[PDB]
Design a protein around this ligand. Sequence first.
Ligand code: SF4
Length: 304
Amino acid sequence: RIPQEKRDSVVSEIEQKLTDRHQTLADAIRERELYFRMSVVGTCNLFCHNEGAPTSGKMNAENADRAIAAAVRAGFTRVQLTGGEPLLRQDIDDFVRVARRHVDDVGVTTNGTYLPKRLDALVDAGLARIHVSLQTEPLEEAGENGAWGIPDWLLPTVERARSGAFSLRFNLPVPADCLDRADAFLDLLTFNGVDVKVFSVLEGAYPLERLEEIVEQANARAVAPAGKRPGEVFIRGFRPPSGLRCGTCRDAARCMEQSHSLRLGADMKFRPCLATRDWDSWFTEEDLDATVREAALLALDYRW
Ligand code: SF4
């Protein structure tokens, strides 16, 4: 728990730090490329803090329209639909349509299993991005002889993305003993125009140097047919948090996210940070513009 006067004191410091830079809230959002990450689905009983709960009835198309509109007025130009599995809800394309009314950059982070059922409706709604969180086991099963392959239920999304319908990216976990399988697997993804974000998984330090080399090699090997651009592989470099709050934040050692964003969970809880809950705020039925702005001000506080 954080006293409101301490939260007010911190928010005032962020606003003062912005004026010291001759900067507005929207300019700081643009400089940090901060986006709005709205979780439209909650997963139940999902290991180190608590168990999850289903989606709140307030997480609906109407409130999503208010939250995105308030976020755009605060300075956000991109919305990403997330959660446990956003494609689990049948009205997922409704949220893409709502977000498309306020910004052009609407994306979805999904596990991909529901893409065959939802693909056409998402493109009709004008979805711009699809990020698929891959798992090692389906890649092994989709391949043969131990090599990794693309699961069947992802191929139509891959081809539709290569045709310019939307941007597609795969999040590829690479365990320590799978550097050679991931190396060859990156060729399949880049050839089909799929961007890849690789990251490490799991005594015995991780071979992080060779994985970085594999990324550089896979980008240099990248070829693509029909004069198209091949997919781009990249791995995020670590950088410690350095905001005003991070110096005395009990979770600073576990704050490793490099793509920062203002979050709105399926429980109507705004989250300026991922590693700590101290700065969360509630979704309000009144004065939503000021509530979104205050949470967005705290969302900047990680790098100055
Ligand atoms: S960013 Fe939020 S979470 Fe990461 S350290 Fe600063 S305060 Fe703690």
